[PDB]
Amino acid sequence: ATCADGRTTANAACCVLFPILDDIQENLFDGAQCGEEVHESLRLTFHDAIGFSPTLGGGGADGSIITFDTIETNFPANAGIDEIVSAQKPFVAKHNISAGDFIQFAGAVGVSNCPGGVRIPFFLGRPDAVAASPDHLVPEPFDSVDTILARMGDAGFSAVEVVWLLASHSIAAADKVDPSIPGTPFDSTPGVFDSQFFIETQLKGRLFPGTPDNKGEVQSPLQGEIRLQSDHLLARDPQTACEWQSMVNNQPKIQNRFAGTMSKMALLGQDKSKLIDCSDIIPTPPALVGAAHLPAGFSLSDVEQACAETPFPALTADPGPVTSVPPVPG
Ligand code: HEM
Ligand SMILES: [Ca+2]
Ligand SMILES: [Ca+2]
């Protein structure tokens, strides 16, 4: 098909996405950058989609977190999501796609702006949300590993799929875990979709980057990096540790598994055969920058080996003394 301005797409319903793409790239993502709004938009894909259970209910990736914002943004597990919901709302109102479609589209577009990123398949045609998600369907960083894995399992994901989705934490920061240090990333490269998250979570902890005693947090290996309790434990648990380690220095696996599992997440509560493929709209991401490494000052002895089948790979360390990670600009 050929759209209004001459750009082409396989299925013509998808032409509606071109003006939306242009608009969000300029006016939501600050000129196609991999920064705070991209990261928050990716977080939103999960907080919308995971509100799905075959028995507890919820419509999954249905836009409910926007349409029923006054209910959902008040769930404890959704703390801080109100900012990005408020930012996306006027875009949904202005454009001609459902809220569910918009959230997944914006996430996919955003990930495609990040160096090292991947093109996530994107489907059009989710109907409007019917009801708010039930509460207590979004995992929390202080939930037991088995609780997180069961919740994700209930939604349809294997333990290895949870690991692949958590590649998202390679382009990610926290504002509410430790409110004294908002914008503190989960890896040293929050502007690059890379394996540093999987590496740096495997290191022995050293310090709290801000205050002690925050729920859902444990010690981090680096000033200016924060470590979730859940991420600490998933890197070490027998169900997930070998898969976690397998991501290290394997950019093509990170990309391919993230794209496939994000597609599956984007379709929770939906039927792919009742939607239209608009994957060819997503831009081509920039190339990976940087290579897999231990942080400056670290060595292999600082890695906590938790995969029983295979030792952690030796990686070279950046040169020089231990440095600290800059926060993500708000
Ligand atoms: C498996 C269980 C998960 C837990 C317990 C978890 C927990 C968290 C927490 C506590 C934060 C910080 C929020 C704040 O204080 O500002 C966060 C951020 C984030 N999460 Fe996860 N998460 C999980 C899975 C995922 C998944 C599957 C995705 C996929 C999209 C995702 C994407 C993100 C992103 C991109 C951010 C960064 C937001 C920003 O930088 O503005 N998370 N996550
Ligand atoms: Ca939802
Ligand atoms: Ca990264």
Q: Residues 194, 290: contact at Cβ < 8 Å?
A: yes
In angstroms, the CA 126 to CA 121 distance is 14
Backbone angles phi, psi at 277, to 5 degrees: -75, 120
Atom of ligand 1 nearest to the CA of 177: 15
Q: Residues 222, 228, 229, 232: is their CA dihedral positive or negative? A: negative
Residues with CB under 6 A from ligand 1: 36, 39-40, 42-43, 45-46, 80, 139-141, 148, 162, 165-166, 168-169, 171-177, 216, 228, 230
Letter for the amino acid at 274? Answer: K
**154 assigned to some structural domain:** yes
Letter for the amino acid at 221? Answer: P
Atom of ligand 1 nearest to the CA of 176: 15
The verdict on 276 and 311 lying in the same domain is no
Q: How many CA atoms lie within 13 A of 131 on its CB side?
A: 7
Q: Read out DSSP for 201-229? A: TTBPP-B-SS-S--TTEE-BSSTT--EEH
Letter for the amino acid at 124? Answer: L
CA torsion angle for 172, 204, 291, 121 (degrees, to 10)? -40
The verdict on 44 and 24 lying in the same domain is yes
In order of 226, 243, 305, the CA distances from 312 in angstroms are 22, 11, 6
Nominal resolution (angstroms): 1.2
Domain membership of residue 311 as a residue range: 139-261+290-329
- What is the Rg, in whole angstroms, of the alpha carbon atoms belonging to the chain? 19
**CATH code of residue 275:** 1.10.520.10
In angstroms, the CA 260 to CA 243 distance is 16
Q: Which residues is 276 bridged to in the sheet? A: 124
- The backbone region for 42, taken as left when phi is positive above 0, alpha when psi lies in -120 to 50, beta otherwise, is alpha
The verdict on 23 and 85 lying in the same domain is yes
Q: Residues 109, 21: contact at Cβ < 8 Å?
A: yes
Number of structural domains (the chain) is 2
169 part of the active site: no
Q: Residues 295, 85: contact at Cβ < 8 Å?
A: no
Q: Which residues is 220 bridged to in the sheet? A: 207
Find the farthest-apart pair of alpha carbons in the chain and give their distance in angstroms, rounded: 59
> Measured in angstroms, how far is the CA atom of residue 169 from the centroid of ligand 1?
6
Ligand 1 atom 8 nearest Cα:
141
Ligand nearest to the CA of 194: 3
